[PDB]
Structures are given as C-alpha cells and as structure tokens.
Symmetry: C12
Subunit: 139 residues, 12 copies
Amino acid sequence: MGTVRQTSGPALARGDKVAVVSIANYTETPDAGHSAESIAANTLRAGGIADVRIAPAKAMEWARSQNARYVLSGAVEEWRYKTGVDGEPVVGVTFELIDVSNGAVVWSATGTRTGWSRSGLSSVATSLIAKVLSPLQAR
Amino acid sequence: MGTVRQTSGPALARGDKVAVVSIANYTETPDAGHSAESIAANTLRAGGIADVRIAPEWARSQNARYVLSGAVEEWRYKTGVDGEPVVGVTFELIDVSNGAVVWSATGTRTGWSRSGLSSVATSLIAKVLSPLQAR
Amino acid sequence: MGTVRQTSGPALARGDKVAVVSIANYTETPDAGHSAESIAANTLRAGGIADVRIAPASDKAMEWARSQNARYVLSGAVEEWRYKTGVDGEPVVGVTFELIDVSNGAVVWSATGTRTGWSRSGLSSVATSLIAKVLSPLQAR
Amino acid sequence: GTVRQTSGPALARGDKVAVVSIANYTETPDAGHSAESIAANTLRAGGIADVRIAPWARSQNARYVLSGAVEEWRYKTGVDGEPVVGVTFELIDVSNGAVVWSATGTRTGWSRSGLSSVATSLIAKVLSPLQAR
Amino acid sequence: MGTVRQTSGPALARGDKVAVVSIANYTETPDAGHSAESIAANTLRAGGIADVRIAPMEWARSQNARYVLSGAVEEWRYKTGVDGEPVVGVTFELIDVSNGAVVWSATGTRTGWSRSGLSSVATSLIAKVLSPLQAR
Amino acid sequence: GTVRQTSGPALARGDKVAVVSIANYTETPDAGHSAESIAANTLRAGGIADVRIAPAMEWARSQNARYVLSGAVEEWRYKTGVDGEPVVGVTFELIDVSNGAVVWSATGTRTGWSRSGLSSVATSLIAKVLSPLQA
Amino acid sequence: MGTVRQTSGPALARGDKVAVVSIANYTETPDAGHSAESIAANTLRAGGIADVRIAPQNARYVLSGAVEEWRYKTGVDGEPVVGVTFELIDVSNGAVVWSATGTRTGWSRSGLSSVATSLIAKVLSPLQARQ
Amino acid sequence: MGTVRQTSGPALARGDKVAVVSIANYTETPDAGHSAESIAANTLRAGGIADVRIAPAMEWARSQNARYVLSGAVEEWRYKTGVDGEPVVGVTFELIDVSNGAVVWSATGTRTGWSRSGLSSVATSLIAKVLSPLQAR
Amino acid sequence: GTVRQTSGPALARGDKVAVVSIANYTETPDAGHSAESIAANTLRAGGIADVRIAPAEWARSQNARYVLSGAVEEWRYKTGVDGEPVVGVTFELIDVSNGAVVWSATGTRTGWSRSGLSSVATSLIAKVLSPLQA
Amino acid sequence: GTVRQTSGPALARGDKVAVVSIANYTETPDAGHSAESIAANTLRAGGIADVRIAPKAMEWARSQNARYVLSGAVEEWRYKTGVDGEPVVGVTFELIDVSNGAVVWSATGTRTGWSRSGLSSVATSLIAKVLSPLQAR
Amino acid sequence: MGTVRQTSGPALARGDKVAVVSIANYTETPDAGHSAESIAANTLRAGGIADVRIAPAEWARSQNARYVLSGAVEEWRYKTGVDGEPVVGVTFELIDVSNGAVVWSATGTRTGWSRSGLSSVATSLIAKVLSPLQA
Amino acid sequence: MGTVRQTSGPALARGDKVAVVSIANYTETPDAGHSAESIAANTLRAGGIADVRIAPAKAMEWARSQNARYVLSGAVEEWRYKTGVDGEPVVGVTFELIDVSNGAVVWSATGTRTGWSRSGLSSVATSLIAKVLSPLQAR
C-alpha cells in the first residue's frame, strides 16, 4: 500500500523561513507526532530551506515573532507495526503549509505507506515524509 | 471491497469556502474522527477547493459557504494476525445560509490482509468525496 | 445471508421532513445505535427524501422532532452489531425500524432486517448494505 | 429446535397490543429488550395495527398484553459456536388478567448463522398464531 | 438421555387452577429456576390446563388455585469446553392447596448431544416430565 | 462404582418420612439440597406417600414423622477437563424418630461415562441407594 | 494399587457402641475429614456394628484417624489418590487396641469417592462384627 | 527410589511407651509433618509397640511416663511439577531416651516414586522401612 | 535504511563541540542518553579534540563553537523472538554564535535478526556523523 | 558435580558436635534447616554418639560442652525449571574447634541429579558423601 | 558481529594512578554499570596499571589520580526468548585529572552466539576496548 | 566456554590469614554474593590456607582486628540459569586481593563460565571460582 496525493503550491525559496508547529498524533504510538516533526524539519532543510525551526511546548503570532514566512503543520494518522511477529510497519501522515502572511493553507498533502515484513517503521516514515514534502524543495 | 453511495449535489466552485466540522467517532480507535477530518480536509483541497479549514455558527463567522460533517462507523484492523483493515464513513455537506444538507454520502471498504488502515481510509475518503471536486 | 420483513406503509414524498430519533443500542458494541442513525439518515437521503435530520444527543427527541416540523420520525433498535468471535469471525447485524406519524404518534411502517457476512466482509459494509435494503420502501415515489 | 403453542383467539387488526417487560433470564445484556422490539415488529408485520412497547398497559388502554421471557440468547462457546435461542410468550387479556394464549419456542442455528437471524426467524414462527384475523 | 420417574397422580381437568411457585435454582446458571418456571407454566397450559399463573406462603390460597406446582433445578448448563453438551436435571412436586399434601411428583434428567441447545433440551424434558398433568 | 446397604425395616406406604439437612462436603454449591430434592422424590416414587423436606430432630417430632432420612454428599462434580466424567458419592442414614437410633444406612458411589450428565448419574445412583426404602 | 497394613485387633460384637470422632484433614481438599467420617461410620454399621454416631456418650470404642491424601492428581485424567490412618481406642483405659494405615491410587478413569469408599471399607474390615 | 540409612539402636519392647512429638515440616506441603506423625505412630504400633501416643518440651513425654520419644523432620513431601510429576518424600527421624535426653537411634530415608503412584503410598511405605529397626524385640 | 545529510561547514580539530539533550521519542528508556554518548565518542573519533556532553545557553559558558543536538525516533528490537534491531535518528549542528542550524542529517537502519541493537545504532550514528570529521 | 574436602582431625565416637545455623542462600524455604537435619543424622550414622542441633553467638555450643561445631551454607537446593527439571544441590560446610574458634575442616559439594531423581535423595546422598571424613575412627 | 573504535591516546605507565568513576547504566539490567566498573578496573590492572581504584557510592583529585576512566553502558542483556543471544554495548572516556580534558575515548559493541554467556561477552569486549590502556 | 584472566601476585603461605569481605551481588539472584563468599572461603582453605574467615553482617579496620594479612573481595556480575527449559547456568566473577598492610590491590582476576544445559549452577560457580582463585593456593 502507499499513495501520495498533494495539491499545487508555491515555489519555496532558500530564504523562506519555515516553522514546524505541533504535528498532531492521532495514533497510540507515544511521540509519533514529535518524531514526524523532527523528520519533517530535517527533510525541509535537506530540500534546501535554510532556516527551519520546530516550535516548543493563535500560533500565527508565534510564527510571526519568529519571522517565519510559512508554518508546516499536519497530523499522524498511523505510525505502528501491525500486530504480530513480522507485522509490517504502516505510516499515514497529512501535512499543511500555512502562509503566515494571510493564515491560509496554500499547500497540503496526504501520504500513506505500508512496508514489508522486514522493514523498520522509522525507515518507512522517513522515506514517506521525504516523498510527501518533496514539492517544498527550494530553488 | 465495499461500496460508495452518494446523493446528488451542487457543483462546487474553487472559491467556495468549506469548513470541516466535528466528524464523530463511533469506533473504539482513539482519534479516528480527527484522522477522518484531516484526511477529508486535504481531500477537498486536492479536489480543487482553495479554502478549506477544520473547526477547532462558527462557520458563519468564518464566512464559510459550506460545512462538511459526518461520522466514522468503522476504523480498525479486524482481530488477529493479518486481520484486514476495515473503514466505514458517512459525510454530509451543509449549506451554511439555511442549514440544509445539500449532499451526503456513505462509504465502506475492506482491505486485504497486507493493507494499511490509513491507506484504505485515505483511498475511501477520496472516492467518497469525489463529487465535491472543483468543476 | 439473513431476512428482511417490512410491513406496508405510506408512499413518501421528496418534501416529507423526516427526523431520525434515538436508535437504541442493545449490543455490546459502543455507539452502534448512533452508527445506525447516521447510516439510516444517509440512506433515506439517498432514497430521495430531501430534508432528513438526526435529533441531537428520551421523549425529548420527540419534542425536538415536533419543533423541527418533521412529518415522520424514524426510530428503531440495534439487536446485533459485532464480529462473531475468533480470527475470521464473520460480521453480523440485526436492526428493527419504525416510522412514526408525528401528528398523531401512530406507527405507520416498520421493518426488521438481519444479515451475516462471510469471514472476509466488513461489519460496516454489511450494516450499510442491510439498512439500505431494510429502508428501501421509504424511498421517494 | 421446536415450537409448541396453545389455542388462542383470532386477533383483529384493531386489537391494541402492549408488548411489556420480557424477562431476560440469560447473561446476554438487553436480550429481553431485543426480543421486545422483534416481537413488536412481528405483530405489526402480522397485521396488528396498534402495537406499543413499555418503557402500565392499562394506561395505554391496550386490549392484550404480550409478555414472556428469554431463556436463551447466545452463541455457544468457542470459535464457530452456533447461536441458540429460547423464548416463551404469553398473551394476556388486560380486562380480566387471564392468559388466553401462550407459546414456547427454541432454535439452534448452524455454526455460520447469525444470532439475530435465528431469533427473528424463531419469534416470527412463534407469534404466527397472533397474525390478524 | 437420562430418565423421567413419575409417581401416580390425579387426573387434572381444564378448569383446575394451578399456581407455579418458586422453583429453586441449585445450579450456577443465573435465573435457571425462573426459566424452569416459565417453561413449566406454558407446558401445563399447552397440556390443557386453562388457568395457570406464576408467583412473584398462603398466596395460592388467596388465588383460589387448586394445585401448586413446585420443584428445583439440579442441573442446567453446557458441559465445559467447545461442543460441551447441554445437561438438565429437574424435580417437580404437585401440592394440593386444600391440605398441603404432595399428590404427584417427578424427577427428570437429560443429556443432549454436542450440537444441541440447552433451551431445546430443557423444554423437551420438562414437557415430558409434566406430561402426566395434561388435562384428561 | 459400588453401593452398600445395611439391613433395615420394611417401609410402609403410610410411614411419615422427614428428609433433613444433607451435608455438602463438595465444592459444588447446593449439592446437598439437590440430593435432598432427588431423595425426597425417590422415596415417593418408591411408594412412601408422605415425605417432606425440612426447611432440629425436634422438627420431625413436630411433624409426626416416623423416620428421618439424612446423609451427606462426598462427591458431586465433573472431573476436570473437556469430557471430564461425572462422579457422585453419597451416604444416607434412616433414623427412627421414636428413639433416635439409626435403623438403616447406605453408601453409594458412581463414575459415569464422559458423555453423561452429572444430574443423570446422581439421580440413578440415589434411586439405587434408596431402593431398600420402597414400600 | 496401594497398601493396607494393620495391627491385631479385638473381635467386635454387634452391640459394641462405637463413636466415630474428628478425623483430621491434612489435605488441601475441604471437608475430606468429614467425608472420611461419614464413610467410615457407614462402613462400621455395614460390618455389623449396630450403634455408631459421629461427633458434631458411653461408647465402648472410638474410631479416630486422619486423612493424609484425598485428591485427584493434577491434569486431565489425573488419578484419584487417598491416604488414611485409623486408630481404635478403648475409652475405658484410653489405649489404642487397633490401628491401621491405608493408601490407594485409583485408575485415571475412576472417581475419588469410589476409591475412598472402597479403601476405607478394606481398612476397617478388621472391625467387622465377629459376634 | 532413594536410600535408607539407620544407626544402631536399642531393642524396643512391646511395653516401651513411645511418644511421637513434633515432626518439623520443611516443605511447602501444608500439614506434611502432621501426616508424618500419624503415619509414624501407626507404623510403630504395627511393628509391635503397644503404647504409642502423639503430642498435641520433652517434659510432656515425662508427664506421659514415656520411655522414648520419636521426633524428626520432613525435608520433602510433594509431587514434582507437571502432569505425571512423581511423588518424592524425604524424612529424618530420631529416637530420644526420655531419661537423659540423649538420641539413642536415628535414621534418614528418601524415595522417589513412580509417575503413576500416590504420594501417600510412597510416604507410608518409606516410613515403614525407615522405622523398621524400632520393631518390638 | 537510509542516510541523508545537508551541506555543512568544514570542522577543524580545534572546534569545541557540545552535545546537548538528544530527545527520546521511543519507549526504550535512556535511548537519548545512549545516542548522546555514542555521538560524542563518534565526534572525537572523527578527529574533533574537545567534545563535551551537557548535564541534566550552557554551551556559551563552555565557549563551544557548535552544539550537536537531535532526536531518537526509533531504538528497539522488533517484537518477537529474533525480532530485528531498528534504529532511526535525526541530528542538527547549531552554530553557537547565532543559533542557526548549519548542518542536519537523518539516518535509519534495520539490522538482521542476528544483529545487536547497540551495534546497529553505533554503526548508523558513525555513518550519519561522518561529514563532521576533521 | 564435585566434592572437595580438606584434611581434618580424627573424630571420636565420644566427641560432642553441635550443628549450628546453616545459612540458606536459596529461594527454597527451610533448605538450611533440612540440611541441618540431614547433616546431624549423617554425623550420627558415621559413629558420632552425641550430635545436637541448635535452636559469634557461639556460646550455646560452649554451654553444651561441644568439642566441635558443624556449620555451613546452602548455595543451591531446587529443581531446575520445567517439567523434568533436574534436582541440583550445592552445600559448603565447616567444622569449628570450639576451644579456639579455628576452622579445622571444611568441604564443598555440588551435585546435579537425573530428571527422574528427587531433590531430597540428591541432597541426602551428597551430604553423606561430603561429611564422610567426619566419621568416627 | 560488533565493532571496536578507539581514538589515539597516551602511553600509560605502570605507575599511572587511574580512578574508575561512575559508569552510567543506560539499560534495564540492574547494576550493569557497576558490573562494567569492576570488569574495567580488573582489565586495567591486567593490562599492567598498578594502582586502579573504583570510586565509592572529581573525587579522584584527592586520591592523587592521574587519569579517570568513565563511560556508559548502552546495552547489556540477552535478546528475548529461549536462546536469545547476549549483546553488549559500551563507551569509555579517559580523562586528564590535571585539566579535565578527554585524552582517549572508545566505543565497543558485540553480539555473542546463542550459547555464550553475557558476562563472557562483556568481559572479552571490555578487554579489547581498553587494550590501548595497557601499560 | 568462558575465560579466566589473572594478574601476577604474591605467593601465599599456609599461615597467611585471609579475610573474605563483602562480595557485591550485581545480579538478580538473591544471596549470590554470599554464596560466592562461602565458596571462595572454602576454595582458599582447600588450597592450603589454614585461617580464612568471612566478614559478618573502612572495613579495613575490621580485617586488621582479625589479624588478616590479605583481604579477598570482589563482585558477582552473573549468576543464573539462562531463560527457558534447559537454560544453561552462567557465572561471572571478579576478585581482588588486598594487602592489609597498605591497602594496595596486589592480585586480581576475572572469570566467566557458561555451563551445559545439563549442568548445575552451583557446580559451574564452584569449578570456576576454584580455577580463578588457584594462584592463591599455599605455595
């Protein structure tokens, strides 16, 4: 299993500052949202966004006080191994890119992936998130 | 396997403001309703609706033309090793100016033993909400 | 499979306002009555009834229906809504419905439906398919 | 399974029948309430116009009361344990309090059948002498 | 498949009013005595006895009932395990309210096979045990 | 198993018999009361007309009873496991009320087949054990 | 299947009054000592002792003892096992005039009360009425 | 099986009064020491000792005018774990001269029984063998 | 698994590097502290002379030129007998003079059933941090 | 297992030996007291007439006029886990000269029995072998 | 499997006083850090360092120590299940007491065979890891 | 199998008094340290050391009051059966011999041993400790 569906979106520039804010965790894996935040932040940087920062702890005023052009947020819908020995890793994530200038979602995407029996969950999550956020590469 | 049944509905415009409000969770999977909200909002956006927001009427203050609501009736793997993912959802589209349901749909799907629940859910919701694409 | 038994009933029209009221849950599956309410509301709408509304969370849902100027109330109960026990235990659904004339409280139509899926089927698929069958006489004519 | 009935009156469409508290002698929660709702729809399917379920019968001005008990309503234990239903019904004349009709029915499904299917089919068979004139 | 053993008894008529009073439950199946009570009542009625009432100690005297039907359930369960068979054991006494004497009594036991229903076995057994109380 | 009985008096149809507290030495609840109800109906089916179950020795003297049947259940269970066989063990004593002496006594045990019911085995065994007490 | 080992003993007449007293229960089986009492009491009467009572006076002998084993061994088809000791005591001087120990392992398809009833009957047979 | 080791000892006579005091229970089988007491007392009588009594320290024997005291301990008294786990018994006995408190005789015995034998049978058989030197001369 | 690194500065042997609070997003206790001590020894082995781990702005007091931080996303054996070790880590290198991330990397690895979790983590962390050699 | 013994003094029939507090380092309750009862009977069976078990702090022995004190510890006394888990026993002993407190003899013994042997039989046999140098000469 | 990685370091002399201080336990095996301390201390002695002391529970300044050996245990367990193999992971640092700098560090991991002992694997690994500190 | 590694050390005489002092237990087997102390003390005596005693309940003061020439101390790092039916006994010990006249460690050793599925834990520990302490035989 596995689909990535994304909208159109803006061309990000290297100098666009992006804050990663509170990716919700809708799974029973503790800290899956925080894992998705750390992976997503490094993905955005690896794609050429110079200045990416994860929020600590509306949230618009936090991003503006950070001089951020965009806020990347989203939700983890699935982040687990299926039950049983050799149960496969499954990942499901949604992202939204929020234009801090006007508050509107200017880009979003949903991605899911089902790994093989042999796969690691973090490998599957890291590959999927990189693919999902690929339209947000810079330059 | 599963079916989708949809009523007639209006032709949605790209500029139609849509608020996704409170998708109830009738399952024992925590947060399944919230997952359905996030997936549904992204689906409407990917279908061509520019302005979609999830509520935290409130919609009438946000100047929304339509509200999308609904309920998750099933959202789990069936029991046992290799128990297959199963999903059931209902959606309704409300005209904010008069509160009438102008479109509604029910969808269910059963995946294969190798399928991920979120993949089944995301595919089904896309199919179910497909008459709400921007024409 | 299972069985469906439906009495006779009036021909519904597109403009007949129907309120769906408190479907009782006699199973140990939480919220099964609320799931049946949602599926039933959409089915009635799929059937050509334009204005169909679910009462919010006893006889105060009846008062709500009267305040909505509903012509009929759809109520009922869920007798079964589970997978049978075990790996590959099959889904099973049992439901009863009544259509009540709001102006005088008379039951003008009622029906009972049950169904058993195979090991591979989904509970919600079975429930949705069955309620569609059971409520088919309430389609707009 | 099996069904055994007494003789009874020929009910008319207009006989107001209150379906009252069906006792649950099983460990399946609400099995009596399920039997009540199925029995009520059975009587209506059989042609009895005004059928009501108790939340008393005299305040509804019912002519007959349908009561009874559920003696069994479960799946037997284990994977593919078959459903089994046992029910007794009585029709009571409200004015004089006498039992004017009674029946007992039991049924054992096969392993792949639904409990609610077996109960619905059985209750219809048991209440068939109460179909309208 | 066990036994029924019945004593001699009086011939009952359709108009003999009969009260079924508390059937004791000596099993670990909740309400088995009440189930026996309900089945026994319908059995007597189906047997031709017109007026048969179940009690909620004199009482039957304040009911004009000619006979009291009482008893106890000794066994009412599925034996343990998958395909464990249903087993039932009952004793009944028929009491004359005009003097308190036991005028008829019977014991019955039955073991179904693995694929049978406990309620089917209880119902069939109780019909056979009370058969000498049919209206002649 | 076995059944062993002493000599005893010839019982008449007209002897008033009081069945009293049958002790339960098993971990099956109410086994003593079950044995009381089975034994009472057994004495009747054997021809004893007036036999009544007590709800001390004074109660039988209060009842104009000529004998008192008493005893104890030493075993009354299915052996453990699927197809565990029913096993029953009982002792009985018949007491003459006019002087308190034990005029008769019997012990009975039985192991039924794995496909038999405990109630059947106990009923058949009590009937055989009490058969010297027929009219 | 087990052993019975007894001392010499006196010849009991049908009129010797014998009181069966507290049979100690050294097993995990509730009431096994009481079960042994009722069985032993009936055994003595079945052997010809016309007057036997169990404690809850003026007897010539007293039967006492203890149950060392009274159970099924563990697992399905675990066999019944019984172990008992008995002492016969002349109340006139308190001396044990006869004693016996008995044990038995029944087969997997036998019941505990049968093994125990049969064993107790064999152990107490020296107390049969010889008149 | 196991082993029985006995010391030399005095020839007991029929009229020697022996009191069996308190066999210590060093096992997790409750009352195993009391079971050992009952078995040991019957064993002594079956071997020819006419007057044997079990107590309810050594002064109680003197207050019973007993010539000897049988004491001991149970080291093992169980079925080994699992279905068909075999019965195993281990006991130690000592015979004490009541006059001077000296141990005049002692013995240790152990036995592992067949999977299909009873613990009581193994224990009764072992105690009979262990105590056989105390048979009446 | 995978390893992906950004561009980064050329660390010299004399750059003081502080390793600070690697978050633990697993249910393995102390996995973050294990990553901190493995990462510190990896930086030294790569030719960086002075590496120190923070206890439980302090980097300013140490006059550190860079701060290495990160997060552990996975650090466990998969369930069952012979369940294989899985590791996932992210790192960021922070210029202390202005708080900017000047280098980041993400690494994941799935070992064989015969593999030890610490061997996988140590091997992965060495690979992930190799651009930080002298 | 193995048995290792030092040289020791030549014990006599009339030497008074007190068996004192054998430590229990196992999770088997009372394994130390069982070892004390077996050891005491082993010493008597070996020809030592006067052996007593006690109920620093050695002064109980100096009051009983004992020449030697036998002490020690149980390091292992159990069945290994599982159905047919074999009995395993490990003991250490020391013999103490009461007049000067010097350990004058010591020994260590271990034994793993067969799956079908009883723990008490293994311990009794092992302890009899370990203490056999203390038999009367 | 398993690797040992060591930096360069100073030649230790037989007379260099080394204090082993608090090896952190990052495992769920109680006392694994203390076990590593005892094994490390004996390893350094076996390598020819005369004076090696484990700190009680920069106190080494008072013990006249030239070097402090510290570190952490990242793994010290049998993998789960019957015949689960022993796995060990350790890091070490050698610290100059006079200025507090790390002058040597190393990381070792090892996975034993299913038949080997955890203490055997830890002992062999620690000896190889610390072998640069032989005198 | 396992390994034994010992440093050089002094030659002990039969008349050298040795005190065995608090062997730490770093296992989950209760009293394993006390068991190692008893085994070690008997091992030293079997090797020809006349006077050996185990400390009760700077503990150097106690040893000096016992006139001990050396103190044997150490730690138990492993003392258990591996998990499962037929799980083999495993033992790991460290020892140090302390010169009471100056507090210096003058001898130390590490031993580990993995037994067979059929062997007893106390047999394995006794054999290993005898091997480990064998340089301490009276020579």
